[PDB]
Amino acid sequence: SMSVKKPKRDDSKDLALCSMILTEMETHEDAWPFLLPVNLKLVPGYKKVIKKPMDFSTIREKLSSGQYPNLETFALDVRLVFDNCETFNEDDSDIGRAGHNMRKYFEKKWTDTFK
Numbered sequence: 001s002m003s004v005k006k007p008k009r010d011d012s013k014d015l016a017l018c019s020m021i022l023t024e025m026e027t028h029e030d031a032w033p034f035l036l037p038v039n040l041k042l043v044p045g046y047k048k049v050i051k052k053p054m055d056f057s058t059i060r061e062k063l064s065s066g067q068y069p070n071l072e073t074f075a076l077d078v079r080l081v082f083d084n085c086e087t088f089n090e091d092d093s094d095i096g097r098a099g100h101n102m103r104k105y106f107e108k109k110w111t112d113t114f115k
Contacts, residue, residue, distance in 0.1 A: 014071045021109050030098040034081050054080040
């Protein structure tokens with residue numbers, strides 16, 4: 001509360017460490033469905049159904065330009081990528097399996113880096 005603060009957690013390396021995690025996600029072999037925004041002209045149903053599209057390139061640009069105020073808003077956009085993928089893709093599809101694999105991969109790096 002006012003003039004009563006928990007001890008200051010060091011957040012000075014968060015930007016660098018989120019960039020490293022994002023590099024690792026970008027270079028995973030199963031990243032291909034997620035590297036670029038879904039083409040809303042060429043993929044029927046996507047625009048209407050997925051209210052907030054997100055992809056790794058868009059996260060990378062937001063990261064590079066100070067549009068994440070803290071590491072939790074970064075994790076929210078990464079998770080949005082996989083939540084979108086589950087919304088639109090069957091579990092038993094290549095893209096559906098990719099998304100599960102990537103989410104697992106991300107969540108381990110997140111835990112090991114920050115928790």
